């Protein structure tokens, strides 16, 4: 069992230090400590080996040290590409990973792009109606999606995803409103409403197609 | 370049045995200076070491205690691969599984790099539900999807299980302006996903757009042509 802080944030240019603490039987046992960097949906990469060694290719912005039963990593000149998960690991016959630290690189606020697709005529012929509301390029990662029909708020049949990190450290989300083809025809308006900080952005579709 | 090609994602039904293969190329599975590991990762469990297989004159296995009784790693000098087997799986074994090379430096000063090379990972979901391929519907571009001469067009990858799906456009030729949105878990316990490319609306009459949806878990691939209306 090896402790890391769950979450660390920083602004560009600043310097950051991730603690990795364990027992005399895990971290302080030897100096075979390694650090890894992981971007979402990609494999981890060795960025530090033997406490302070930088594999060939890793910037000097990446530093590593150890004191007692706490190894530690440091990122200077925090760039946006440094947003990722980071893990320490230790060799003692068996291999112990720390629980991980998500590192955020702070960015200015951004309002979402919103795109609404009506149901395809193909899905309607299969007795199904899905409205797709795509929300991208917002920051920080928190939105509020409401749906309306002919102006009236709707709750039945809505499924909305958690925000997820894009490759520009902004956030994307998606929201779906499921209906039968009849309800899709029984109204003349459907809307997706996306609120973020102050801004709300609303898009409307109508079955005249 | 040492590369590790892994064994393709899918579903393992409960109580059955998980089986994955890592094929090495650019290194020898019986390397003096190497060890061949399996590591898994889950959003709630983190990185979990599973065990190693190494050859120093004789063949060797270390395993981690949480799997010691259910696990087997099997090197294959014939094929230049090693395999992972995990018995009696439960939902707790749903994870992305990685094969990694543990590398030591045997020249001048000894260095212990750790996991220097990683396979791309294969997602295994342990579930009693059955695999289902996606239904792909076109999200058509329309003058109602344009904002200043840009058109948004997409594929709705509906009702598939398990994960993952990969989406490309025009067989991987169209990559700029592509946005693929992570999947929603429906209340039916099926997944759906949407993928969009932003394109010049002036190219809608001259460029064909096709999304290529690959669902390895069901050995299904769908290419859907998205036309405007």
Author numbering:
A (entry chain L): 3 to 211
B (entry chain H): 1 to 229
Text from the published report:
Therefore, the two cocktail antibodies have distinct binding models on the RBD in the context of the spike trimers.
The RBD of SARS-CoV-2 spike protein (S) directly contacts the cellular receptor angiotensin-converting enzyme 2 (ACE2). Here we engineer two bispecific antibodies (bsAbs) using distinct designs and compared them with parental antibodies and their cocktail. X-ray crystallography and cryo-EM reveal distinct binding models for individual cocktail antibodies, and computational simulations suggest higher inter-spike crosslinking potentials by 14-H-06 than 14-crs-06.
